[PDB]
Amino acid sequence: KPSASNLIWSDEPAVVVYPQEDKNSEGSFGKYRKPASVWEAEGYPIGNGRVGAMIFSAPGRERLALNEISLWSGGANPGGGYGYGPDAGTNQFGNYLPFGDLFVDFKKGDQPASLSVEDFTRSLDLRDGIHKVNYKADGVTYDREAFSSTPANVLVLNYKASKPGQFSADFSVNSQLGADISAKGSVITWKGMLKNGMNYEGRVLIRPKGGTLSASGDKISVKNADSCMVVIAMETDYLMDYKKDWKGESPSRKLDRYAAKAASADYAALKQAHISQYKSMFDRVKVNFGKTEEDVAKLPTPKRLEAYKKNPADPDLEETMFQFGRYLLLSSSRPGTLPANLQGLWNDYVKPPWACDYHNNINVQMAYWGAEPANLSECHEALVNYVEAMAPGCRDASQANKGFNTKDGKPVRGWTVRTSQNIFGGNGWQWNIPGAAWYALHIWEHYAFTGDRKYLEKQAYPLMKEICHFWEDHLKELGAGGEGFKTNGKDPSEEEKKDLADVKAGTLVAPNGWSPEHGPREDGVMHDQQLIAELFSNTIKAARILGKDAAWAKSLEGKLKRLAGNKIGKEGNLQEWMIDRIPKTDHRHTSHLFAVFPGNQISKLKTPKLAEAARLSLEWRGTTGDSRRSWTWPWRTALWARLGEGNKAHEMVQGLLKFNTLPNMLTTHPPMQMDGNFGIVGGICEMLVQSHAGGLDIMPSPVEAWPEGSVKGLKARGNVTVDFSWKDGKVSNVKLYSAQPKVLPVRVNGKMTRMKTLPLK
Secondary structure, three states, rough: OOOOEEEEEEOOOOEEEEOHHHHHHOOOOOOOOHHHHHHHHHHHHEOOEEEEEEEEOOOEEEEEEEOOOOOOOOOOOOOOOOOOOOOOOOOOOOOHHHHHEEEEEEEOOOOEEOOOEEEEEEEOOOOOEEEEEEEOOOEEEEEEEEEEEOOEEEEEEEEEEOOOOOOOEEEEEEEEOOOEEEOOOOOEEEEEEOOOOOOOEEEEEEEEEEEEEEEOOOEEEEEEEEEEEEEEEEOOEEOOOOOOOOOOOOHHHHHHHHHHHHHHOOOOHHHHHHHHHHHHOOOOEEEEEEOHHHHHHHHHHHHHHHHHHHHHHHHHHHHHHHHHHHHHHHHHOOOOOOOOOOOOOOOOOOOOOHHHHHEOOHHHHOOOOOOOOOOHHHHHHHHHHHHHHHHHHHHHHHHHHHHOOOOOOOOOOOOEEEEEEEEOOOEEEEEEOOHHHHHHHHHHHHHHOOOOOOHHHHHHHHHHHHHHHHHHHOEEEEEEHHOOOOOOOOOOOOOHHOOOOOOOOOEEEEEOOOOOOOOOOEOOOOOHHHHHHHHHHHHHHHHHHHHHOOHHHHHHHHHHHOEEEOEEEOOOOOOOOOOOOOOOOOOOOOOHEEEEEEOOOOOOOOHHHHHHHHHHHHHHOOHHHHHHHHHOHHHHHHHHOOOOOOHHHHHHHHHHHOOOOOOOOOOOOOOOOOHHHHHHHHHHHHEEOOOOOOOOOEOOOOOOOOOOOOOEEEEEOOEEEEEEEEEOOOEEEEEEEEOOOEEEEEEOEEEEEEEOOEEEO
């Protein structure tokens, strides 16, 4: 009986193909059309935040498509273009790249291993972070395991069998980048230098027990061994420091310190240390949404998802999706290394969709939506450390932009970003002028959730203040009744000016904005205003907590009160623009609901009239086929959840799974984009616990699809850990934990109580 949840698995061997089209036979793709389509749907991913693999296991062959998170082309990209590809140099944007592949060709004796196998399963077990294969052939049971170890800092593979002397295979490395590959002794080494100067090296260290080991050509063969452990180690000379030209130690010198040592350890010891580190992160949150029918829970994941599409009743599969988002984030994001990109850290493409980059118009943010509420707070440090380290490049691009110059012709203070960023301070494509303000929301929430004052004073507040200065420089002043307002460059019409009537003098608006991704270009679009008000408000809070810059903070509190704010339109919707344009639209985006989520300005508790207007706006967006994207479902999940529509929020979870999830549970835009996986964690957390509206609010509205369940380990602002259960329409067993004894207002079961915390075990 395969576990009903936290296990992704298939009874079908993976399709194994080379990422280079020309390297594959006529029908090697099975039901797919191209190697990329195979890769995104068939692979199971492992990672330790820095190195990872997408694993394609079959009885005859096995492909590990390999990644190290810093392998990037491109560079400073001073012209702001969006050119990429593996040969992109310092004057271009560049892209995340594939590191290599390990191919394993299994043999029986000296002939190919048979595919006449029995009881084949390949599985990604989320409970221990291990990819597992198991099958039977000719009375012999074979087992494979693979994981990405944080303590050992390598990928570890292990092949075993029920009888001695049964393991034979040929190991080979594939590169799409022209790497130089050579085998010697028991190690395959591959290395290269990108056109932008980045050096990289990988090593595959083969460690059989028994049998023979020979190195012919650049392949390595193992014959008639008992078992075989493999270590895969990979490094670049990337260093996240612009003052060092982004260059640190050579990759060979890094690998010399640890790879051989890891390959010399005992497999059982490597495995135990991995599982222990892994559970220390994964086990922080446990949820139960209900019990799926045993006949449905027995289905392999591809068939279970096809079944879900026709009858979406599978709370255990939804629990798996939720935990997969946590698994993917902890596997792609750690404090000392780069943040998760559009695909986490997994990529097979030399020219990936959207450069597999850092998109700050929603994607990178959504990637971190689960970091704080789902108890993976240290993962969020990777994002903030990145933002700090890329800022000198953003200041360069922002100062070079004469369009940002103040009225005195001086360059702007602070910085903002273009829509895309690489790992060298480069910015690409359209300016995303409020994007740094949105970064500042993550910078503040890391403090709101942890209470880490050192973080706030040393890292967060200096960034926030600089982003504020940019807006103190770029905001535009309006006269009474909208005097000065521009829309698409022209003055407002007489009908338009009727909306502009109540605008007091000195009103501050972001000039010439765009509500993402439709309409006109005009002053004070509500998306911009909300992002700025959130930036100013949180920076002001930070200053007073740190007792710093009191004068400028009260100065800012005045500009905050002068910003154009939210308006309820004549039809009752929340306005998306200063002008009262019709809310009936199918448009995908709901950019003026930022203030409901992920922002903090509109809540049911604190601003009921604005919330009901927001709820009408979202209702009138409807749900059409074009509103189906990897990133719409999780945002609408969180929105509906915060607006008290639990059932609507659950319908968005179902929609993600029905329409935008691949057979391996990776979300797809299309093509594959992990924002959905990452973001649905945040959306589901808001269905269970809210802490943005003045205190803890536990399951504020029911979810009929989850009549009975429980959670342990969710995080709330102020660094509180939350456990509870629910059954019928009642929440019970509410228990709050903190490090310091506190007393808190708690809304639960429709009543506002006050409870004290228990100490954090």
